[PDB]
Amino acid sequence: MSLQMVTVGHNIALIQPGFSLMNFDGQVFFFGQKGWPKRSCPTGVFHFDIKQNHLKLKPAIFSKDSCYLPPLRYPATCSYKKHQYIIHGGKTPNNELSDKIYIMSVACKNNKKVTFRCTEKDLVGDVPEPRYGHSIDVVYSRGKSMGVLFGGRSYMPSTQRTTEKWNSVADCLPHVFLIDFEFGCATSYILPELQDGLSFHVSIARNDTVYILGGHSLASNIRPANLYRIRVDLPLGTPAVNCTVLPGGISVSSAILTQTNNDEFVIVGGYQLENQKRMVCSLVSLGDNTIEISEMETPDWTSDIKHSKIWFGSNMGNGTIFLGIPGDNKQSEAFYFYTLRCS
Amino acid sequence: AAEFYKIFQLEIGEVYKHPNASKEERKRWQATLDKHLRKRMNLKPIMRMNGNFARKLMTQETVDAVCELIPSEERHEALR
Amino acid sequence: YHKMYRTVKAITGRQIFQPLHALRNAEKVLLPGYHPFEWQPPLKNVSSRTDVGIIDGLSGLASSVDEYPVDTIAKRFRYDSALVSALMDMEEDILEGMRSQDLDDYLNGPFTVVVKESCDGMGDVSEKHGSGPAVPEKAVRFSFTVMRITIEHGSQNVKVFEEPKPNSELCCKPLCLMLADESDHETLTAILSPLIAEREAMKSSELTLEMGGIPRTFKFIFRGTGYDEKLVREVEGLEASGSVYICTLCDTTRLEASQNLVFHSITRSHAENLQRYEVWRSNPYHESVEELRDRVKGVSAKPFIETVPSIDALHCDIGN
C-alpha cells in the first residue's frame, strides 16, 4: 500500500491516458505515446526506468526485420509463454481503428541496451472487427496454449455511419473469439450465457479459465456487478467453450490488474459511476476452481487523487502499479505521476 | 482577495503544523487549489488577478469549496 | 443597432430601420440549411437532409470517464450545405457572369467550381470562465474560399466568376471553428476527420440545385493551399522542426539542396505519402532505422489531408 510520488524527465509531454507498460525479464518498458514518432525515438518504445522516484525515458531500437508499428492508444495486453508479449488493435493517433495483431519479442540484448522484434501476422477465418477497450488472455489446456478474445467498443459499421455521428461508438458483439497464435486462425463462438456487451474490463488468467469481472456496457449505461468464468478445453476436434455466470462479482470498469504473488492478484482504481471513482481495492484470491473477492484496507490516497476526476495507468508486473493524475491546465507540468506498491 | 487566496493556499496544507515547506509542496498546493476552484466555482487560474476574480472569490461558496479540502474542522470554522 | 433604431424611430417618427426580429427572420435566407438540394449520386456516409445547420464539431465524440478525455469546443457546418449556401449567396453574381460572356441565362451545363481550402491555427486567445472542459487557450480555424466558376460551353471551357481580391477578409468563408491546439494531433484528427470524409465523398459526385428558376448541376474540385509549412508537415507526413529533409515538394536533402539548388522537380503527393507510410510501417525489405528512413524519404506518420503541393507567399516573404 506504499504511495510514492515520482518525478519525470524531459519527456512528460509524451505520456497520455491509455498507454501500456510491458515487463520483459524484470525490465518495464513503455508503449502508446502521444503524437506521432519524432526524430528522437523513431520506433515508439521507451526504457521505462524509475530510480529514486525519478523517471527517465530512453529510446529503444527495434531489430532490422521488425515492423515499425504506430502508437496504439488502447490495445489488448497478453503475456504468452520464448517470453513474448501480444497487443491487438486499438486507436492510432489519427483516430482510426486497427484489426491487426503484433507480437513483442527481444531480438538481441547487450550491455545496457535492448533491441526488440515486432512481427506481423494476418488472421484468417472469423476475423474480429477493429475495436478498442477489449481484453485478451491465453489459456493452457491439455498442453495446448491458445488465446481468447472478448468484445469491446467499436465504431458503427460502414453501412450506418454518418459524418454527423462519425465518432459515435457502439459496444462490440457479445461473441467470444479464440485466437491461435501459432497458426493465425480464429473461429467465432456465440454463447447464450453472454447477452450484453462489456468494455474496459479486466482479464485474469489460469490453467484453463479466464475470469472477466466488472466492466461497462454502453447500451444500458450500467456497470454490472457480474463475474463470468469461461472454461475452455482443447480436444482433438473443434474447441468447446463454456461460459458460467458466477455470483459475487464487482461493478468496476477500466480497472488495473497486477500480479503480486502466485494465485494472488489485486485490483485498484477505476470508475464505479460516470462521476464516481473506485476508492477501494479488491484482492482476488484464485484457486483450483474457487474465487473469493475480499476487501482489503484502502491505501493512503492524497488530496489530489481523492479530488481529481481522471486517473489512468498500466501494470508494472513486479507488484507495482503506475497511475497518473491530470496535473493542471496547460497554461505543474500538465500531469502528476504516482507509483503504487502492493507488498 | 490576493491575500485571502494566499491564506487558502497555506491553509489547504496546514502550514500551522508544518512551519517548513519546500517549493514543490507549495506548487502542488497551487495546482490542487486551482483545480478545485475550477471544478466547483468555475474559475480559471490566472496570473494577474482581476476584480471579477475578487468578487467571485469573496463568497461563502469559496470557503466551502476550499474547506472541504482541509482535513481539520477548526480551520474550517476559522475560515468561515 | 437596437439603440440606433430606437433613437432614430423616436426622433424621426417614422420606422427607417427594421427591428431585430425582422433582421433575424431575414437572416435565415443566407445561413446554411434553408435551401433544398439533391445529390446525384448520393454522397457516401453523408445524410441527404436539407435542414442541417450549426452542428457540433466534435462529431458525436465520446466524452465519458472511461475513454480518451476531450477538452475542446468545436462548431462546424456540413461541407455540402456550406457550399450550397455559398453558391446561392452569389446567385445574381453567377447570372451576371454568365450574361457578360455572351452565353445564355437558363443554361444548365455542369459547373466546374474550384475551391481553395485554408486552415491556420492561432495563439493567445483567452479562455473564458464558465461551464465546459479544460479547453486550452489556442484556436484553430478551417475556412474555404471560392476562386473560379466555369461552365462547359461548346468545345472549350468559358469562365464566369473570378474572385477579384482573393486575399481579402470578404471571401474567406468560415467552415469549422474549433478552440483547440494545432500542436495536438489526436484532437485535430478527431474534429477534422468528418470534414475530410465529406470532402472525399463530394469529390466524386454531382449536386443539383434550383438556381434561379432553372435547375443546374455542379461539380467541385478542391485545393488545400492555405496552409503554412508547420501545419503542412504536421498533417501530410514529414517530421516537425527542421529535419535532414526540408522541402514539401521534392525528395531533396539539405546537403544537395545547398549544393545544386537550381535543378529540381516536384515529386511529393498524398498517395505517395500514404504508400511511403505503408512502407515505413511494414518494412518489407528488412532494413534498420536509418536506411529505412532514407528509403521512406522522411515520412513517419499517416497523412489524412490531401494538401496541394504549393508555397505560401506571405510566409515566404516573412521568412525571406
Ligand SMILES: [Ca+2]
Ligand atoms: Ca497563424
Ligand SMILES: [Zn+2]
Ligand atoms: Zn524542394
